[PDB]
Amino acid sequence: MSGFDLSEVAGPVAEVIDDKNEEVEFVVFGVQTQPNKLVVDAKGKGGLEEVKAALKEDALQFAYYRTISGDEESKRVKFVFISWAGEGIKKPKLRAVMSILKGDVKNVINNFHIELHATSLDDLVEDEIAAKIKLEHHA
Ligand code: NA
C-alpha cells in the first residue's frame, strides 16, 4: 500500500532472527525518497542501546532487534519492533506516511513480541521494554 521499495528489509530481518547468525542482533532502517525506499542505516551486534545510537532526531526510521526474556529459565528470545519519527523531521508529508509505511514494513517484519512507536529517546528505555515483554509473555 505505501509505494515504498522494501527490498532491503527481509534480508536483515532474517539475520536478526537467525540464532546461528550471531553477527547480526539488530537492524535500523532509514527512509529515502525519490525513489521511495528503505535502506539499512545500521546493522550488527547489540540491542537497544545500539539502536538508540542510530536513531536521528530529524529522521523517520524503523528498528528491529533481538533480546532475551525469562525469570530466568526458560530464557527465551524475544523480538522488538520500533517505529521512529524524530521530533526534528522537517517535512510533515514524510510524517504522514508513517502509518501506511509501517503497515507495509510489518508485513515483512511479522515476528515481534512488542511494537513501540517513539519520537524521543526517552520513549525507549530498557527496563520499560523488558517489563512490557514480561507482561506480554504472561498474557
Ligand atoms: Na542473528
Numbering used by the authors: 1 to 139
The authors write:
EhCoactosin, an actin-binding protein of the ADF/cofilin family, participates in actin dynamics, and here we report our studies of this protein using both structural and functional approaches. According to in vitro binding assays, full-length EhCoactosin binds both F- and G-actin. Instead of acting to depolymerize or severe F-actin, EhCoactosin directly stabilizes the polymer. When EhCoactosin was visualized in E. histolytica cells using either confocal imaging or total internal reflectance microscopy, it was found to colocalize with F-actin at phagocytic cups.
EhCoactosin consists of a central core of β-sheets surrounded by α-helices. The central core is made up of five strands: β1(26–32), β2(37–44), β3(60–69), and β4(76–85) forming antiparallel strands while β5-strand (113–117) forms parallel strand with β3 and β4. The central β-sheets are flanked on both sides by a total of five helices; α1(9–17) and α3(92–107) are located on the N-terminal side, and α2(48–54), α4(120–122) and α5(125–137) are located on the C-terminal side. This arrangement of secondary structural elements is a common structural feature of proteins belonging to the ADF/cofilin family. The loop connecting strands β3 and β4, which has a conserved lysine at position 75, is called the “F-loop” and it is expected to participate in stabilizing and binding to F-actin. As described in more detail below, the surface of EhCoactosin is highly negatively charged, and this F-loop is part of the negatively charged surface. The N-terminal end and the F-loop are at two opposite sides of the globular structure suggesting that EhCoactosin binds G-actin and F-actin in very different ways. Although there is a general similarity of the overall conformation of EhCoactosin with that of related proteins in other organisms, the surface charge distributions of EhCoactosin is markedly distinctive. The overall structure of EhCoactosin is quite similar to that of human coactosin-like protein (HCLP), with an RMSD of 1.56 Å and few major differences. The N-terminal regions of the two proteins do deviate by up to 14.7 Å, with that of HCLP bent towards the inside of the structure while in EhCoactosin this N-terminal region is extended.
